[PDB]
């Protein structure tokens, strides 16, 4: 019946935390925002698939209030000269949005890769543990 009213959803997924943030198609207006660390207590759980899932539900609720129906997803890790694998939690944000009623448009990996780069932290020997 109804047309598909679309929003953008950005997802950042590092080793330490996950950040979820909905915007208009222009990226220049913000509709809702949450993080894993907002909902959980212990610092070691901010990357947890569970904390990501709790934080996604709050964002899904506010979007349903503002009257949105469909979503495009752009997802990333940290990149630059650092790690460029998508962290834990990133792939549970997406599955949660699908259990909520939302129709999924398109998914894209938008991690910032460098053609060559500045020097990384850690010294010539690296972390010793």
């Amino acid at each position: 019946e109804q047309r598909l009213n679309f929003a953008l959803l950005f997802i950042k997924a590092t080793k330490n935390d996950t950040i979820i943030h909905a915007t208009d198609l222009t990226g220049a207006e913000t509709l809702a925002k949450s993080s894993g660390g907002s909902k959980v207590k212990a610092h070691r759980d901010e990357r947890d698939p569970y904390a990501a899932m709790l934080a996604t539900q709050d964002v899904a609720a506010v979007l349903k209030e503002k009257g949105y129906n469909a979503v495009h997803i752009k997802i990333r890790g940290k990149g630059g000269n650092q790690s460029k694998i998508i962290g834990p939690g990133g792939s549970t944000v997406i599955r949660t949005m699908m259990r909520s009623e939302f129709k999924l448009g398109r998914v894209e990996d938008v991690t910032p890769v460098a053609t060559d780069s500045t020097r990384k932290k850690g010294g010539r020997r690296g972390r010793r543990l």
Binding site: L4, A70, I75, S83, K84, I85, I86, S91, I94, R95, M98, R99, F102, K103, L104, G105, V107, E108, D109, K120, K121, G122, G123, R124, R125, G126, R127, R128, L129
Partner: protein, 101 residues
């Protein structure tokens, strides 16, 4: 005593090579010596493809993949168990490993 004929590295007929940084600890390692690993991972997990089939707006959809080459120093490769210690006759066997997902 000399443990390996190739000194543990792939350099021949050269003076010097570019360095790269270890994924796990950021140590510098020469490119011709570093342990290398290839990854091709779907953006969406296998446990969600059955929901994707009812969530998508398109008639059919192909999931996007993500591609990586990772580098490791000797200590990290041994500790993460990418490689293992082997007997004096096994050391000589060379075979290509699988691409991970």
């Amino acid at each position: 005593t000399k443990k390996r004929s190739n000194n543990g590295r792939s350099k021949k007929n050269r003076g010097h090579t570019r360095c790269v940084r270890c994924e796990h600890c950021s140590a510098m390692v020469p490119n011709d010596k570093a342990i290398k690993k290839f990854v091709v991972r779907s953006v969406i997990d296998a446990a969600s493809l059955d929901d994707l089939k009812i969530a998508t707006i398109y008639e059919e959809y192909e999931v996007p993949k993500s591609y990586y080459k990772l580098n490791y120093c000797v200590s990290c490769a041994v500790h993460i168990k990418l490689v293992r210690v082997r007997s004096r006759w096994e050391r000589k066997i060379r075979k290509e490993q699988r691409v991970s997902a």
